[PDB]
Amino acid sequence: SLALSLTADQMVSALLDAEPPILYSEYDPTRPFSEASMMGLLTNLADRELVHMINWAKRVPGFVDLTLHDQVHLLECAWLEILMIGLVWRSMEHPGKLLFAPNLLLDRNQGKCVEGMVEIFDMLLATSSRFRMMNLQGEEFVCLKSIILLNSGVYTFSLEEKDHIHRVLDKITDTLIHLMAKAGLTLQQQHQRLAQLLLILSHIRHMSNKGMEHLYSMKCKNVVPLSDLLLEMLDAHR
């Protein structure tokens, strides 16, 4: 593998260069928002984001080494997690607001359009505020996002493909510590910040699960057209 031979800085630049673009949404500020249009915008947006995420995942170190079937599993497992942490990252410098797109800036009042959405929105907002207080760096974000991709579906697979993934995950942990050490953090501060970042992933998982079951419910409620790719990603969680 080439990923295991990548230095800390080489890892960072690789993840940074592989970053997907910030897509725009179909949004008409003139048009009136409804609990099917606004969900339609997010669905349309996420569907296009998925295409970039798939190609992004290919450039994540160690991911192409895995079997195609395991690549499918990992992405099926963590796609909403990765979308959400991206959303939370973009929304950091917009307190009390979620930047789904540069032209789509939402707050809690507009999340009331859909039922159960306001709880997800508050959790997303809290995660964003948490990132802001920690002063999360872009170099740290791309590490966290790549961790989610590799970790989220590793315990739901004598393949021995799991060992390689853990080896890469350890390399990313080395990368994070290297970043914090360069930021002038003491040894205690490094381990603390590392822990703080990874505990947030537990909450992002929680938001994904809660978000997933809310996507599956309105799938049966034909009010919103879920794309063919998105439907197959939903089927994975059953």
Binding site: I54, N55, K58, L68, V72, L75, D228, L229, E232, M233
Partner: peptide, 9 residues
Amino acid sequence: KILHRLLQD
């Protein structure tokens, strides 16, 4: 499997 196709190329 759309995800499977896009992953190949």
